[PDB]
Amino acid sequence: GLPRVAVDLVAPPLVHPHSQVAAGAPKVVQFRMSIEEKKMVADDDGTTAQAMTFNGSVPGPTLVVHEGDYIELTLVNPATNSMPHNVDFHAATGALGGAGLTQVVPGQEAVLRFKADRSGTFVYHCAPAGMVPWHVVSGMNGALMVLPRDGLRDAAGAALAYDRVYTIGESDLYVPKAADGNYSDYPALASAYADTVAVMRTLTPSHAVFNGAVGALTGANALTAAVGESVLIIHSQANRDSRPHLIGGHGDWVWTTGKFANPPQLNMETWFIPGGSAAAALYTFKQPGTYAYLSHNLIEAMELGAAAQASVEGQWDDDLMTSVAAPGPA
Ligand SMILES: [Cu+2]
Ligand SMILES: [Cu+2]
Incomplete structure (x- = not known):
């Protein structure tokens, strides 16, 4: 370095815690986680698932932180678980975130860190590679947150x-x-x-x-x-x-x-x-x-x-x- 821290975590829902715001610162934180996976369940029924996650849960946790810171984380995975993982985150940056790094696997872990930065919340997530988704979906993830610181x-x-x-x-x-x-x-x-x-x-x-x-x-x-x-x-x-x-x-x-x-x-x-x-x-x-x-x-x-x-x-x-018124118617 810173510180760191850690944280914790928790779971969911819840968250954890923290614070928111712160112050514190930154830192780192840490965390951790773990992853886991598981399974579960978911628902109730039971169902379940498986798942995965982270921790565990778903978702994862968350974390937170712040922105810145960083973160860390770690992661872990474990081992257990398985798978792997991771993570991624979003957050961060890079890688992606982270994833790569982270990865892890299982076990492992890782860690990472980152930063955160950015813020818020975011998510994390697995992944792984492939897977992622699965993962994430499963679960995974978560978230973170961041916040810122310140716070819101x-x-x-x-x-x-x-x-x-x-x-x-x-x-x-x-x-x-x-x-x-x-x-x-x-x-x-x-x-x-x-x-x-x-x-x-x-x-x-x-x-x-x-x-x-x-x-x-x-x-x-x-x-x-x-x-x-x-x-x-x-x-x-x-x-x-x-x-x-x-x-x-x-x-x-x-x-x-x-x-x-x-x-x-x-x-x-x-x-x-x-x-x-x-x-x-x-x-x-x-x-x-x-x-x-x-x-x-x-x-x-x-x-x-x-x-x-x-x-x-x-x-x-x-x-x-x-x-x-019441118614118725019435
Ligand atoms: Cu995974
Ligand atoms: Cu993504």
Whole structure:
């Protein structure tokens, strides 16, 4: 040289713691882680896944820181576981972131560282190579954151714150288934892876868720818171896207993317885220119750898952518302 520281861690959702613102210164821271893977479951048924894551968871844791510172871481892976991992982151720169370096494987571880710177929230995440895615888716991753320183614121410136936171894451896833358908388962892882891837491719897823598962957150777991317060948430895723958212518520513020620187825106519703990344947112618450957271789409958330838741518490018122018446027628 510166110172360283360481831281711790925791888981888711938651975161851891821381513161925101511161013163312180830167430184470194540391852381560690571980891764784981595982397986688981896712848802418830059971378913588961495996896953992966870182620690464990888903898602892863886250871381935171611131811106510147650186861271460291370480891573581881273980052994046990297986695978490897690583881571991437987001954030840172280079390588990628770281991744390469880281790677680781298983056992181983490583560480780384870176620175942171930137711121816111962113895522881481795995991867490884091939694977990455697977990972891332598974788971993983877461876120871271850163824141610134010162713280936151618105647109214107013113310131713102928251319290718381938471975270968530888412895742997505894927697973596967067977033939018958258923778914497947496985154990281992690887076986698973292959287937896853295938578924993734386708894309778608398965588932988504947130954290892881478904438920987771828721118840217990778921988350928481218260018414018033514020818261923151963150878321894441890675891958894817888513968106877220928451428911018731718204956112317030935112951122978305996340870163822171720117512105935121316011218210828203838802947112977104993217895937990868994360974111964141814131818221617160018112018323119470529960718530838821978631995404919205628803378906995815518811268906797948994503878502968741947261718771718251417280018181119521019535016025616002019522019823017146119631229804128825016577
Ligand atoms: Cu991994
Ligand atoms: Cu990435």
